C-alpha cells in the first residue's frame with residue numbers, strides 16, 4: 001500500500017439529484033477544513049507550512065453514466081484541482097513553485113504513466129486553451145457527464161486539448177467553487193433540480209475571482225468590519241459594496257489561510 005492512501009470521495013452523474021450533490025459537496029468540505037480555525041464563523045483551510053504531505057490531498061472519484069472514471073487530486077490548503085488520473089495514466093498541471101512540484105510526486109504513484117503539463121491550471125491559461133471564456137461554458141449535470149468522459153478519453157487519444165481545458169473548468173466550478181461558496185453550490189443545485197445547463201452569471205464569476213481577497217478581508221476585518229469596501233457583482237453585472245462579514249456568512253463556505261488563528265477564539 002502507499003504510506004497513507006489519501007481520502008477519496010465518490011460521486012456519480014448516473015442518477016444525480018440535489019440530495020446526492022449536496023451530500024457529495026458536504027463530504028468534500030468536511031474533508032478540507034481543519035474542523036477548527038473558525039474566523040467569525042467561517043472555517044479556514046489549513047496552513048500549507050506545517051502541513052505534512054500525508055495530509056495534503058483529497059481525491060475525488062468522479063464516476064459516470066457509462067462506467068468511466070476519473071480521480072481528481074484536490075489540494076487541501078486551497079481546494080485547487082492539481083491533476084487527475086484516468087485508467088493507468090496521471091496528468092498534473094505545471095506547479096507554480098518548487099514546493100508544490102515536490103509534493104505532487106506523492107500523488108498517484110502506482111500509475112504507470114505520469115505526465116506534468118506544460119501549462120498551469122488557472123482559469124486564464126485554461127480559458128485561452130479552451131478558446132471559450134467561463135461565461136460561455138455551460139454548467140450542470142449534463143456538462144459534468146461530458147467532462148468526465150473527455151478527461152478519461154484524453155488517455156486513449158480522444159484528446160483535443162480545447163475540450164480537455166473546457167472539461168477542467170467545468171469540473172473546477174461544480175466541485176472546488178461549490179465547496180468554497182455555499183452560493184455556488186446553490187447555482188449548481190438549481191441546474192441539477194431543473195436539468196438545466198447554463199453558463200455562470202456575473203455574481204458567480206466575481207465570487208470565483210474574489211475568494212483570496214475575501215479570505216484576506218475577513219481575516220484582517222476589525223471586529224466584523226472590512227477595513228475597506230469590497231465590491232462584488234450582481235447577477236445583472238451591477239457592482240455593489242460589502243462592508244461587513246455578516247453579509248457574507250450565507251455566501252462563503254470556506255476561506256484560504258492568511259493570518260494567525262486569531263488569538264484562539266474557538267472553544
Ligand SMILES: Nc1nc2ncc([C@@H](O)[C@H](O)CO)nc2c(=O)[nH]1
Nearest residue numbers: 079080081121122123172176208209
Ligand atoms: N486547476 C484549478 N484551477 C483553478 N483556477 C482558478 C481557481 C480560482 O478559484 C481562483 O481562486 C481565482 O480565479 N481555482 C482553480 C482550481 O481549484 N483548480
